[PDB]
Design an enzyme around this catalytic site. Structure first.
Site, PDB file in Angstrom:
ATOM      1  N   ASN A  11       0.793  -1.251   0.000  1.00 41.16           N
ATOM      2  CA  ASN A  11       0.000   0.000   0.000  1.00 41.16           C
ATOM      3  C   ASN A  11       0.821   1.296   0.000  1.00 41.16           C
ATOM      4  O   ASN A  11       0.299   2.354  -0.341  1.00 41.16           O
ATOM      5  CB  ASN A  11      -1.021   0.013   1.137  1.00 41.16           C
ATOM      6  CG  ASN A  11      -0.369  -0.109   2.498  1.00 41.16           C
ATOM      7  OD1 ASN A  11       0.610  -0.847   2.668  1.00 41.16           O
ATOM      8  ND2 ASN A  11      -0.915   0.596   3.478  1.00 41.16           N
ATOM      9  N   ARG A  12       2.101   1.206   0.362  1.00 39.43           N
ATOM     10  CA  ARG A  12       2.985   2.380   0.402  1.00 39.43           C
ATOM     11  C   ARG A  12       4.443   2.063   0.089  1.00 39.43           C
ATOM     12  O   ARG A  12       4.869   0.901   0.145  1.00 39.43           O
ATOM     13  CB  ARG A  12       2.908   3.088   1.773  1.00 39.43           C
ATOM     14  CG  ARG A  12       3.164   2.190   2.984  1.00 39.43           C
ATOM     15  CD  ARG A  12       3.840   2.949   4.149  1.00 39.43           C
ATOM     16  NE  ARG A  12       5.256   3.208   3.868  1.00 39.43           N
ATOM     17  CZ  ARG A  12       5.803   4.415   3.702  1.00 39.43           C
ATOM     18  NH1 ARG A  12       5.066   5.525   3.831  1.00 39.43           N
ATOM     19  NH2 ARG A  12       7.101   4.506   3.424  1.00 39.43           N
ATOM     20  N   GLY A  13       5.192   3.110  -0.249  1.00 37.02           N
ATOM     21  CA  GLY A  13       6.644   3.056  -0.366  1.00 37.02           C
ATOM     22  C   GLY A  13       7.102   2.065  -1.424  1.00 37.02           C
ATOM     23  O   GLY A  13       6.557   2.023  -2.537  1.00 37.02           O
ATOM     24  N   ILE A  14       8.116   1.273  -1.082  1.00 39.72           N
ATOM     25  CA  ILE A  14       8.675   0.357  -2.043  1.00 39.72           C
ATOM     26  C   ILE A  14       7.650  -0.715  -2.365  1.00 39.72           C
ATOM     27  O   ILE A  14       7.592  -1.167  -3.488  1.00 39.72           O
ATOM     28  CB  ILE A  14      10.010  -0.275  -1.546  1.00 39.72           C
ATOM     29  CG1 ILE A  14      11.129   0.726  -1.695  1.00 39.72           C
ATOM     30  CG2 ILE A  14      10.393  -1.390  -2.428  1.00 39.72           C
ATOM     31  CD1 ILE A  14      12.465   0.199  -1.095  1.00 39.72           C
ATOM     32  N   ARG A  34      -2.877  -2.728   6.451  1.00 40.27           N
ATOM     33  CA  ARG A  34      -3.435  -2.690   7.811  1.00 40.27           C
ATOM     34  C   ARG A  34      -4.439  -1.571   7.997  1.00 40.27           C
ATOM     35  O   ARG A  34      -5.500  -1.784   8.578  1.00 40.27           O
ATOM     36  CB  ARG A  34      -2.328  -2.542   8.868  1.00 40.27           C
ATOM     37  CG  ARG A  34      -1.701  -3.851   9.310  1.00 40.27           C
ATOM     38  CD  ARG A  34      -2.682  -4.699  10.131  1.00 40.27           C
ATOM     39  NE  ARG A  34      -2.409  -4.699  11.565  1.00 40.27           N
ATOM     40  CZ  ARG A  34      -3.353  -4.793  12.501  1.00 40.27           C
ATOM     41  NH1 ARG A  34      -4.636  -4.870  12.158  1.00 40.27           N
ATOM     42  NH2 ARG A  34      -3.025  -4.798  13.784  1.00 40.27           N
ATOM     43  N   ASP A  48      -4.498  -8.226   9.146  1.00 32.80           N
ATOM     44  CA  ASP A  48      -3.305  -8.397   9.961  1.00 32.80           C
ATOM     45  C   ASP A  48      -2.660  -9.713   9.549  1.00 32.80           C
ATOM     46  O   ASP A  48      -3.164 -10.780   9.889  1.00 32.80           O
ATOM     47  CB  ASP A  48      -3.703  -8.457  11.432  1.00 32.80           C
ATOM     48  CG  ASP A  48      -2.512  -8.577  12.354  1.00 32.80           C
ATOM     49  OD1 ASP A  48      -2.722  -8.570  13.593  1.00 32.80           O
ATOM     50  OD2 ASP A  48      -1.363  -8.687  11.841  1.00 32.80           O
ATOM     51  N   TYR A 137      17.927  -4.404  12.153  1.00 31.63           N
ATOM     52  CA  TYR A 137      18.047  -4.494  10.698  1.00 31.63           C
ATOM     53  C   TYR A 137      18.710  -5.807  10.269  1.00 31.63           C
ATOM     54  O   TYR A 137      18.216  -6.507   9.380  1.00 31.63           O
ATOM     55  CB  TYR A 137      18.882  -3.306  10.153  1.00 31.63           C
ATOM     56  CG  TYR A 137      19.125  -3.469   8.697  1.00 31.63           C
ATOM     57  CD1 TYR A 137      20.340  -3.966   8.213  1.00 31.63           C
ATOM     58  CD2 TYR A 137      18.097  -3.215   7.792  1.00 31.63           C
ATOM     59  CE1 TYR A 137      20.527  -4.192   6.823  1.00 31.63           C
ATOM     60  CE2 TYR A 137      18.269  -3.418   6.434  1.00 31.63           C
ATOM     61  CZ  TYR A 137      19.474  -3.904   5.959  1.00 31.63           C
ATOM     62  OH  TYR A 137      19.571  -4.117   4.605  1.00 31.63           O
ATOM     63  N   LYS A 141      16.813  -8.946   8.145  1.00 33.44           N
ATOM     64  CA  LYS A 141      17.307  -9.461   6.868  1.00 33.44           C
ATOM     65  C   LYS A 141      17.745 -10.922   6.917  1.00 33.44           C
ATOM     66  O   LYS A 141      17.559 -11.672   5.965  1.00 33.44           O
ATOM     67  CB  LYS A 141      18.511  -8.640   6.442  1.00 33.44           C
ATOM     68  CG  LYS A 141      18.987  -8.921   5.041  1.00 33.44           C
ATOM     69  CD  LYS A 141      20.156  -7.961   4.704  1.00 33.44           C
ATOM     70  CE  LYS A 141      20.779  -8.356   3.391  1.00 33.44           C
ATOM     71  NZ  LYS A 141      22.078  -7.622   3.032  1.00 33.44           N
TER      72      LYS A 141
END
Lengths: 221, 221, 221, 221
Positions: A11-14, A34, A48, A137, A141
């Site tokens: 729904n957003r960004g990348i 969400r 969710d 982070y 990953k």
């Protein structure tokens, strides 16, 4: 020709850049989200993904409309709402892994029956982070990569590939941030989407258990 | 529209497949080769890329005809003819790195002036090897990855990318060799070529210092 | 109580420091060296470890005196005398691996019969290097790590361990070199030796196929 | 001579073996635990290390009795109580990282003032795990390693080292489990403790940001 694609967190960004790239290429694209009003052009399912029963219903709805998911892009990156101290933030990092496990396990069932599938997991965009943030982070990953490699071994010769794309800094003081990037710039979100599209194509059929960094050289060493 | 492409070691096997993929895509493709016959349809220079003078002469000849090399594919893999004890084979590993150093350093001159370039290094096809064999393989591949990453850091923000494609087992008893490959088959050479073509494309402009395994999940874990 | 220890390349620098640490610990220590003078206090054999016959003769001589080698330390680092262009230096990388292959393969014979052994390979001290330099360094170290891991897998459950110690910058303008080392100083050679002694000890019996960096945090990220 | 040592999660398993090894060597050893009756010989503080205020009081109590912590061993491994489906288990994996961040940050304050310290983080013992379990394992370990490396860079030249010990299978059907271990056996918990003791010693003063696998070759490749 047109495939049933699902982008979780699309729904957003990348996530959105990836979803648009598949839709622009003519695929049937569904997304999970969400909250908020989802972007136009997609079969958008509010849910969710940490919840097995909500994931089940999401997939029910998608399979009834688009047919079973042939390409799953699990955008496990830290969302808006989420991005608290770095130390308490690891709980958010754990919820992102759990959701990934569930959506992938659900997609594998139909891909196994089709004897074909593409699963691409997307790690978080890089930002400036303290020690606990950098640990979170790295954990996020490695979790994706560990999951992808295990599934590749577990599924064996069923023509379903599992790969990870690891974005670096993505354009969504600028000179000080890019000074650690060899290419000396931010990625455009379309650059991440192009790699995702490549991995999802028949041209990448022999690539599995791989992590592809799209980071301008940032994390190479 | 069409770029000047050079594939060193491009007269057979994976190198030839790569040259064909760029030719099919409409690029002007030259190859170098050490021995054998040249493939038909390509500007081809017979030469020993470990010799600086022969390298300069090959590039002079090629670029007079095609213009300065914009994409260099250095197929560094062990060749048919090279394919000795492992102790002696370390000298072949040495010469394979030497040749790669010479052709890349030569290409970087024009690329730096153009402020754009693509360099893709291809490691050896995997074989069944004993201990010193595996050591020499690991040394050869790490040399390429170390070279690419150092170059990415040194050239910095000049829009030249340096990447490594690492093939697994490639089709150039069979069921026994591929029992260790999660996808359960050999790569076709064209599959290696497709990844090289993607890395050379404008869609992979933010990928640098990366090693992309095309190995069916063989070397992942 | 005292073991027969061999340090190849043990006449100066880190190799000498390692030989001294085992001597201080009460072991019977032999060294090989290519050129220079031998250190006093040690059984020392002048020889070219790239030559199988010279290696057999060095071991014959050493073991007549000390008994079969129980701990082999192969100091594979670039030597004073070796320390050429980088393209030519790949031949020195080749010979450094070749020598390591020959001395280890020779040691493995007695260790396999004894059902116990310790083999520790030491990579080159780090220097300031250009692109092909860094490539040759990466190739040399990866060759050692690949060799150790292959041997660990091949020898299996015979209680012989194979490990690599990877020094960073070692003391054998200073403030400029060590500005990239998080601990902010050079290693003393004795610090490298202490890790080698630990790996050779019965306390490290479950460590194998490992690369232990003694580098002040230099190469970690 | 005698140092103030803290082992978080030192009440059972490998944590206890580590705690005993330090106490047997003459150090003053404190431990944290959540429930049960703690083992004899230690200053044992019942607390939830995910809670900043409980960690503060724990350290208060320890510093008043033993003096400020000079060696912190954070056993971030999955405890008894914890070891649910693998998918829901990642929440446990996140709570282990958070506790680690807090105890380390608290210990760094006094080590910074002393201009000396040792921080060793211990990843989970390996067990047989499905795909989601293996992802959770990989995430947990990479989190520790990412944290250690960041702190090493952040602290710089303050003589405080940060390292990770990664145990493999540890002895706490047996033939089927060890068949993937080159050394062909389980580790004894004392073998893990010996490596921890080495990293905490003055002999390991130049090792920082390192991961030491004590796994019999299990995870080397």
């Amino acid at each position: 020709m047109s495939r049933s694609v699902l982008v979780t967190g699309g729904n957003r960004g990348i996530g959105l850049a990836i979803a648009r790239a598949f839709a622009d290429a003519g695929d049937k694209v569904a997304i999970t989200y969400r909250s908020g009003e989802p972007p136009e052009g997609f079969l958008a399912v509010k849910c969710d993904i940490t919840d097995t029963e909500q994931v089940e219903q999401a997939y029910k709805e998608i399979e009834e409309t688009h047919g079973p998911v042939e390409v799953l892009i699990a955008n496990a990156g830290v969302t808006k709402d989420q991005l608290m101290s770095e130390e308490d933030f690891t709980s958010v990092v754990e919820t992102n892994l759990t959701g990934t496990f569930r959506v992938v396990k659900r997609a594998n069932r139909a891909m196994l029956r089709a004897k074909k599938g593409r699963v691409v997991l997307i790690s978080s965009v890089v930002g400036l982070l303290g020690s606990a943030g950098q640990a979170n982070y790295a954990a996020s990953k490695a979790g994706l990569v560990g999951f992808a490699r295990s599934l590749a071994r577990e599924l064996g010769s069923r023509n379903i590939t599992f790969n990870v794309v690891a974005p670096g800094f993505v354009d969504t003081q600028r000179a000080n941030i890019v000074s650690q990037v060899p290419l000396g710039r931010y990625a455009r979100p379309e650059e991440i989407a192009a790699t995702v599209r490549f991995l999802a194509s028949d041209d990448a059929s022999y690539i599995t258990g791989a992590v592809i960094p799209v980071d301008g050289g940032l994390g190479m060493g």
